[PDB]
Amino acid sequence: MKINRQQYAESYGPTVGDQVRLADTDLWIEVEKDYTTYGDEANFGGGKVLREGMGENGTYTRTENVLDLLLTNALILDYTGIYKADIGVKDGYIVGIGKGGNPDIMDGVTPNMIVGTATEVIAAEGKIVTAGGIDTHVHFINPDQVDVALANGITTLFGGGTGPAEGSKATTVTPGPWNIEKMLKSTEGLPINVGILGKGHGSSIAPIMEQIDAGAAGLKIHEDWGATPASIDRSLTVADEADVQVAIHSDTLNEAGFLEDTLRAINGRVIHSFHVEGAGGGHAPDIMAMAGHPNVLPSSTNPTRPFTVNTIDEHLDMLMVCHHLKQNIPEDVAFADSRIRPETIAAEDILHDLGIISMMSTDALAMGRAGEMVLRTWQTADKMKKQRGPLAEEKNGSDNFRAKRYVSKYTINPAIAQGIAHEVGSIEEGKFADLVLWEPKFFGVKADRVIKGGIIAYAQIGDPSASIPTPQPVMGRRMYGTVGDLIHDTNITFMSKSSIQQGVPAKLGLKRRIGTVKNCRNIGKKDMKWNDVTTDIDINPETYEVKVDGEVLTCEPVKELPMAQRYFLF
Amino acid sequence: MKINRQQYAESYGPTVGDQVRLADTDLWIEVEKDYTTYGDEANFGGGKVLREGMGENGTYTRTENVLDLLLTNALILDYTGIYKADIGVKDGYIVGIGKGGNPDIMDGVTPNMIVGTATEVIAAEGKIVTAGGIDTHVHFINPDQVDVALANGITTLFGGGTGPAEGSKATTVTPGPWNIEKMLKSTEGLPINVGILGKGHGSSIAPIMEQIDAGAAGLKIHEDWGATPASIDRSLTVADEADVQVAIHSDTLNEAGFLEDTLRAINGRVIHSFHVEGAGGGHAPDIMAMAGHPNVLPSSTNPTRPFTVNTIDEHLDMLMVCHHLKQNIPEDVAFADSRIRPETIAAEDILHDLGIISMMSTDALAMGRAGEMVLRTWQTADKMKKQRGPLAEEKNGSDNFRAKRYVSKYTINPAIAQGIAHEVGSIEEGKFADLVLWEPKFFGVKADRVIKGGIIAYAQIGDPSASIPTPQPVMGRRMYGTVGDLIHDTNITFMSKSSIQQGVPAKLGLKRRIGTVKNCRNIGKKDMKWNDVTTDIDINPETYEVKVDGEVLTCEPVKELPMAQRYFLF
Amino acid sequence: NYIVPGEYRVAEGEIEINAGREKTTIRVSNTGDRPIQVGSHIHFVEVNKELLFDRAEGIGRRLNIPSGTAARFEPGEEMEVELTELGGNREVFGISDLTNGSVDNKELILQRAKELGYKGVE
Amino acid sequence: MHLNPAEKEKLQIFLASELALKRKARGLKLNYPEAVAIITSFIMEGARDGKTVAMLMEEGKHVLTRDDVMEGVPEMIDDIQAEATFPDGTKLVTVHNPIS
Amino acid sequence: MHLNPAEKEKLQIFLASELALKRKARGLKLNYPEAVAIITSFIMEGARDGKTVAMLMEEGKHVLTRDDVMEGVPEMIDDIQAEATFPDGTKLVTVHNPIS
Amino acid sequence: MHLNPAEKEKLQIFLASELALKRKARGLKLNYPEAVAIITSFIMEGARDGKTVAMLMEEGKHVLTRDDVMEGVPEMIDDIQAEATFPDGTKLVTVHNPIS
Ligand code: NI
Ligand code: NI
Ligand code: NI
Ligand code: NI
């Protein structure tokens, strides 16, 4: 008995060779392989396969290779591949990717993916499943920002801040042991993973290091606190001892040095260069040259992503507000203006496409949009396909190479940069079950269901008073994973090794899962998945023209994007 | 180099001799002194002063005289003065008022106000900063009342109730050990400071005292529970032993006695007379004479504040609902009517202006508006300036004397009355960092940011999905101080000394800061800051005419107020 | 009579910044090819290497400009600026690591500046 | 805008009134919450217009009549209460037996 | 509909603008939040219409004049900022001194 | 009014429909949430009018046509579901392929 491909895909989701359009973009992903056995697909419902004695095993206890949760028929989009599989979760972690069901009667069941009495089912047929987004440039300014992030598929927030204080409104910094302790306590009520950055400023080691011992997961060097050669040096000395990452927003003003002076202070040590294009900050006009260096892990923030006809016009007033500047001070305006360059924004699109900028991030509420990291990643990829063509690496008319390059920018690469990729950042066995389901028509725009530690935390769902959950109004809502004490088990607070060793979680009464930051001093650009390119980037100091391999990098701004007015009510 | 005054004030806020209009009132406050050193003002942002090696010290650890938080360039309005200073916070307390920065290079830095690696910054230039309001007449009826209070700058709620039960809807009473324990537990989730009043009723000591031992912070005598000579006497005997305050709403009906009988039962002991004008309750028509006595701490509730053309018409039906009365019972209506007198309401405006009524309060949800204590204080002051003129005590055309008299009514005086002024109620070194920032255009109307225990708890802030926090809609929102376990460290539960000694917090699992009620039996009217006047108040039993020093006190109702239709959407 | 809510009525006169401190005027050039902007409170001797001026005259000093303002030097631009004296303890730590102690140590500061290529040391 | 909690809530009343007025305009007899919404929004808009509390206490009895509402609705509404910002600050309007 | 948090919030702005426009139409001088709501909703609807950010930065100065608002309201509004989905994605419109 | 949770939420749908109808009236092709809002509010108002579930299941297919909406919107909406109080209590209306 044979099933035609259209009918097969409508019942079980796509299989090998089938393509799926991402939202209303012109990007197509192709199923590379499929772990199923045709005829033994898992499915749940009335009269379906996952029933006792049939596709559900009735013999084994939860310990005997049985799952807590099976996602059936997922189309996985990940740096590791674009492929069809069931995903098995147990103890809040991904334990199997393969084929779930009952070895009693089905062929090809992955041995630890038994559907048993203990197993819940989520139907992923017809959905794209990705890792939760890892946003490493978060300003903690307004707690309402968490749901905004969850709604666009973000599951980890790394950054700093104490609320709408001017320091936090400008910089991703939770300063000092007391503010850090307070924000670790606040984090107990935030339904998302969190890591906190201390102030990467000082000329003595102890004031910086005591933040790490207090529970910070990294440091932020920011020009608004003095991005001086001394602060850069001391922060990196601390980071090398503590095994945490340092993010830098460099000296735009060139007050104490030019880019080359900052690089000399870094002295070959590992660093995460935030908003490397420079609208979000850094040595004017040439900061983006950072992204050529082997010891730099470069990210963009999102308002420059991608280059559009309205991009430049929004930026001056945005910057003035964020950095507490005054319109009537000419040098304030000159500083702001110096950061805003169509030449570097246009080149930034291309550097993403070439794998020279490795990461995306938001800059949430401080020149960035908390719920648009994922959104703008795909808009950038789409613009580049339209303007540059399919990448040379592609085959069979699919955009799989580009899709892997771009998904890596907001999943695995930020996790690697931060020292947290042992826990999060990809759909791999042994990692925490932070998973996002998307309907392809809404891919990258509005997440269907966001799973955190194996329980749904956020979902687009309808009328709670209705007979079923689909009637209007369908809106983003927090789910049971966020309620009561379950918020503790479904989320991770990432902390330094020293704070963990010193018992900070017990001292503060933290009940969340505690994640250890590690292995972030022994990495470089080479470790950025699908985005590992080192090169000499030349930026003309007069014209701001950007050159790589002797070629000027430029492209046009676009008047329209996909993933925009078709979807949004405002 | 010299800066003209207009430009100076626009950059750093006003300095000595400058005046600021309070909202749209005709009240002007003048800067009395300024702790800065001109040229070394602290400020934060891109290319600003608070940067490492410059205005931020890079040497000292958090313990070495470094702050957790600096509010830069605040215009303080407090009973202690109207003046310009930086405010330094550490461990959740105000530790320095003076000049912050870096002693390496700046003149005049207050020694314990170093901006270091550990220091967050809030820009207060151009803001008025006051202590959080202390509302001592709160009915705990609807938890939604907390945000209403925070939005108008209230940070402490003292009162009683169990929700919308008739006892609580009429009286500020949480009755008995079990209801008190339950509400102490509820309080763990309320983002505001709290103290709970037990029922000040009984003819034996033990039923009253066991409420104090259970964790009550004071008692309420209310006529709806029988404001008899016995209940008055026993409550005050308990209070004198326990060192807590007693609030009284006296026998309006004159059922068991006239005012003189209540005063005889009080027998010279300290008492807080609620809604002393009497619309909110008390011996008809002459209760307001209480406010002349040295042992009485007199407050108003807010619906009579100030006397307007619509005041009388709203009151009858309000009273009927609050006190569970029936329109078809003539004596119910007669009781209600007996409380509502334009003669005493008009005199109440003047008694406030003369410093004879010492405190304001809301009466939230039981003949009072939870978010209008601060609002109506300033409307009263403005009305009195318009009708009475500047006070004789004023100089240089400023209203500083009136401003200090009136701010004291809702900050320091209620704190003194309640026995909590060692912790809250003013901007002074050593007190808890409950601070409210106001834009002068919104002063007394809508708070900008409300700081609780050194962390922002509530703020008027915009779109959480935007690139910056200023785009619309700007509305009041809970901030990180209210989230997770941080709500425990940023708020105080005030309790009796005996309950604390007996381990009630541990017994109930209370995690909030625990404040001790003390020193409230050894005070009197003389201890009410700027409002310490004792005098014989005569109220004519036939005409309700009020006389002080042989002079009739009367004024006209007004048809319009400031701080009203310019600001509110409804 | 028109009411601007929250408006100021400032007093007469003017505010003198850095009163009583010695002032020094010097010429400074941006010899680099990118703009350099210098804040009010940076120890002047520790600014960007490619600013050319008599480095000794920046020791223990900063710009005599309102707190939070700056002087901007476009590429090739020479400007005359006025400096004031640092106050407090007259110590500087960090920044470019030229001082790390008392600003009185002119010989040490200049030795370090010269060795690191800060333009304008004799 | 600086919306406080009450301003946000009371937007709902205006919206419910607009809904109810559309229902009335297309010929429907109004139900209990519809009738309450219309009278409530009427009061709050009257305050905004600068009417007195006493004016609105009486006008509120003439907004809807029994032929505008379903059977029993007049008897279900004993009173309607609403607070709004008058020229002289927030005041409470109580309308007794608004629909005879 | 799949409403996200911002879509839900921004419905309120449209509603407040509709309220304010009704108040203006019956002859009232508008207050601070009313004026802000009208200008804000104007900006967001302009984005929906496909205007540019630069167009709206200027048009926003011509929505209300000082005779439309109460005394002091023009001076209370230093700027209005709003974000909306343009044809090319979310952008921020800042209108300086919208009412002279 | 005694609003329950659903009554509060469903006010939003009516508001979104009013917004969308204004956008349509000024000549815009409607997007996905706009189209869903209009059809949903149509259904709930139809229930209020006393139509049957079966009537609304069919009428819901004739509210908007493909020329009223942006490219791809008809194919994005597989069905719309809404519950409302009919004369005989709450019922669910499912409209399949409302825009051809
Ligand atoms: Ni930055
Ligand atoms: Ni940032
Ligand atoms: Ni009372
Ligand atoms: Ni009361």
User: Taking ligand 1, which is a single-atom ion, which protein residues have CB atoms under 5 Å away?
Assistant: A 249, 280-281
* DSSP string covering A434-449: -EEEE-GGGTTTS-SE
Where do runs of H (alpha helix) occur along A443-491?
486-489
CA distance B346 to chain A (A): 42
Paired residues of B250 in beta bridges:
none
No. of helices (H) and no. of strands (E), chain E:
4, 2
Annotated active-site positions of B, please? Answer: 323
Query: What Rg, from alpha-carbon coordinates, does chain D have?
Result: 13
- Whether A367 contacts A303, CB under 8 Å: yes
- CA geometry: angle at B516 spanning B511 and B522, to 5°? 170
CA distance B218 to chain D (A): 30
* DSSP string covering A513-529: EEEEP---SS--GGGST
A274 CA to centre of ligand 1 in angstroms: 6
**CA pair distance C73, C44, nearest whole angstrom:** 14
Q: What one-character DSSP code corresponds to residue A291?
A: G
Q: What one-character DSSP code corresponds to residue E30?
A: B
Catalytic residue among A323, A324, A352, A422: A323
Specify the experimental method: X-ray
Q: Which two tokens stand for residue B404?
A: 């200090």
Residue A57: half-sphere exposure toward Cβ, Cα within 13 Å = 24
Query: A-contacting residues of B 316-355, CB under 8 Å?
Result: none
CA B231 to chain centre: 28
Count of other CB atoms within 10 angstroms of residue A389: 9
Nearest residue of E to residue A304, measured between CA atoms:
E91
Paired residues of D85 in beta bridges:
D90
* Out of E5, E16, E40, closest to residue B569 by CB: E16
Count of other CB atoms within 10 angstroms of residue F70: 18
Strands (E), B140-282: 154-160, 193-199, 218-222, 245-249, 271-273
Question: What are the structural domains of chain D?
Answer: 2-100 (3.30.280.10)
Q: Hey, what amino acid is at F46?
A: G
Q: Is A214 helix (H, G, I), strand (E, B) or coil?
A: helix
Where do runs of H (alpha helix) occur along A370-509?
373-388, 400-410, 412-418, 486-489, 497-501, 504-508
B307 CA to centre of ligand 3 in angstroms: 19
- Whether B186 contacts B168, CB under 8 Å: no
- Whether B511 contacts B185, CB under 8 Å: no
State whether E70 and B565 contact (CB < 8 Å).
Answer: yes
Q: Is B275 annotated as belonging to a binding site?
A: yes
State whether F37 and E8 contact (CB < 8 Å).
Answer: no
What Å distances lie between residue A7 and A10, A15, A211, B194, D96, CA to CA?
5, 11, 58, 64, 66
Task: Look at residues A445, A293, A262, A308 and name the one whose alpha carbon lies nearest to residue A357.
Answer: A293
**CA pair distance A493, A505, nearest whole angstrom:** 10
Output phi, psi for C18, to 5 deg.
55, 40
* Out of A147, A310, A563, closest to residue E86 by CB: A310
What Å distances lie between residue C3 and A153, A342, B28, D7, CA to CA?
49, 44, 12, 25
- Whether E33 contacts E15, CB under 8 Å: no
What Å distances lie between residue B534 and A151, B289, F51, CA to CA?
62, 10, 73
User: CB distance from D2 to chain B under 8 Å?
Assistant: yes
**CA pair distance B449, B557, nearest whole angstrom:** 33
- Whether F59 contacts F22, CB under 8 Å: no
* Out of A144, A309, A321, closest to residue E5 by CB: A144
Name the one residue in this structure whose structure tokens are 């003390």.
B518
What is the rounded end-to-end Cα distance, in angstroms, of chain A?
Answer: 50
β pairing state of B218-222 and B245-249: parallel
Task: Look at residues A251, A357, A384, A370 and name the one whose alpha carbon lies nearest to residue A303.
Answer: A370
User: CB distance from C93 to chain E under 8 Å?
Assistant: no
Q: Is B293 annotated as belonging to a binding site?
A: no
What Å distances lie between residue B550 and A284, B341, B357, B545, B553, CA to CA?
76, 21, 18, 11, 9
Q: Which two tokens stand for residue E21?
A: 């426009």
Q: Which residues contact A483 (CB under 8 A, 6 or more apart)?
A: none
CA distance B404 to chain D (A): 23
What Å distances lie between residue D89 and B380, B537, E28, E37, CA to CA?
12, 29, 17, 21
- Whether A132 contacts A438, CB under 8 Å: no
- Whether B42 contacts B49, CB under 8 Å: yes
**CA pair distance F6, A466, nearest whole angstrom:** 9
Q: Which residues contact B334 (CB under 8 A, 6 or more apart)?
A: none
Interface test with F, best of A472, A560, A565 (most F CBs within 10 A): A472
B159 CA to centre of ligand 4 in angstroms: 9
In CATH, which superfamily holds the domain spanning C1-122? Urease, beta subunit (2.10.150.10)
State whether E4 and A476 contact (CB < 8 Å).
Answer: yes
User: CB distance from F70 to chain A under 8 Å?
Assistant: yes
Domains of chain C by residue range? 1-122
**CA pair distance E92, E94, nearest whole angstrom:** 6
Q: Which residues contact C43 (CB under 8 A, 6 or more apart)?
A: B53, B54, B105, C58, C60, C61, C62, C86, C92, C95, C98, C99, C103
A281 CA to centre of ligand 1 in angstroms: 5
Task: Look at residues B60, E22, B319, B134 and name the one whose alpha carbon lies nearest to residue A203.
Answer: B60
B199 CA to centre of ligand 3 in angstroms: 13
Residue E34: half-sphere exposure toward Cβ, Cα within 13 Å = 23
For CA atoms B275, B281, B285, B291, the dihedral sign is negative
Q: Is C107 helix (H, G, I), strand (E, B) or coil?
A: helix
Q: Is B220 annotated as belonging to a binding site?
A: yes
Give chain A's length: 570
State whether B51 and C41 contact (CB < 8 Å).
Answer: yes
Q: What one-character DSSP code corresponds to residue A354?
A: T
For CA atoms B380, B385, B388, B390, the dihedral sign is positive
User: CB distance from E33 to chain B under 8 Å?
Assistant: yes
Beta-carbon contacts below 8 Å between A and E = 103
**CA pair distance C117, A264, nearest whole angstrom:** 13
* Out of C8, C46, C88, closest to residue B103 by CB: C88
Q: Is A240 annotated as belonging to a binding site?
A: no
The DSSP H or E segment spanning B497 is: helix B497-501
**CA pair distance B439, C98, nearest whole angstrom:** 42
Q: Which residues contact D77 (CB under 8 A, 6 or more apart)?
A: D32, D35, D36, D39, D97, D98, D99
- Whether F83 contacts F93, CB under 8 Å: yes
**CA pair distance B98, B102, nearest whole angstrom:** 13
Nearest residue of E to residue F17, measured between CA atoms:
E11
- CA geometry: angle at B566 spanning B449 and E25, to 5°? 130
State whether D19 and F11 contact (CB < 8 Å).
Answer: yes
b/e sequence B111-135, b meaning 16+ C-beta within 10 Å: ebbbbbbbbbbbbbbbbbbbbbbbb
Name the one residue in this structure whose structure tokens are 């307004």.
A142
CA distance E1 to chain F (A): 4
* DSSP string covering B457-469: EEEEE--TTSSSS
Q: What one-character DSSP code corresponds to residue A433?
A: -
Q: What one-character DSSP code corresponds to residue A290?
A: G
Cis peptide before A473 (omega within 30 of 0): yes
**CA pair distance B162, B180, nearest whole angstrom:** 9
Chain C residues within 8 Å of chain A (Cβ atoms) = 32-39, 42, 46-50, 68-72, 75, 93-97, 100
Chains in contact with A, counting 3 or more C-beta pairs less than 8 Å apart as contact: B, C, E, F
Residue C65: half-sphere exposure toward Cβ, Cα within 13 Å = 21
Residue B144 with chain D: CB contacts under 8 Å: 5
Residue A352 annotated among the catalytic residues of the structure: no
**CA pair distance B101, B282, nearest whole angstrom:** 53
Burial label, A440 (beta-carbon count in 10 A; 0-12, 13-18, 19+): middle
b/e sequence B164-184, b meaning 16+ C-beta within 10 Å: eeebbbbbbbbbbbebbbebb
**CA pair distance E41, C5, nearest whole angstrom:** 25
Task: Look at residues B557, B532, B560, B564 and name the one whose alpha carbon lies nearest to residue B345.
Answer: B557
B171 CA to centre of ligand 3 in angstroms: 6
- Whether C95 contacts C47, CB under 8 Å: no
No. of helices (H) and no. of strands (E), chain C:
1, 10
Q: Which two tokens stand for residue A256?
A: 């104490």
Question: What are the structural domains of chain A?
Answer: 1-131+426-483 (2.30.40.10), 132-425+484-570 (3.20.20.140)
Nearest residue of E to residue D41, measured between CA atoms:
E19
The DSSP H or E segment spanning B513 is: strand B513-516
**CA pair distance E61, E79, nearest whole angstrom:** 10
Query: What Rg, from alpha-carbon coordinates, does chain A have?
Result: 24
State whether C39 and B47 contact (CB < 8 Å).
Answer: yes
For CA atoms B388, B392, B396, B401, the dihedral sign is negative
A297 CA to centre of ligand 3 in angstroms: 65
Output phi, psi for A504, to 5 deg.
-60, -40
* DSSP string covering A20-40: EE-TTSS-EEE---B---TT-
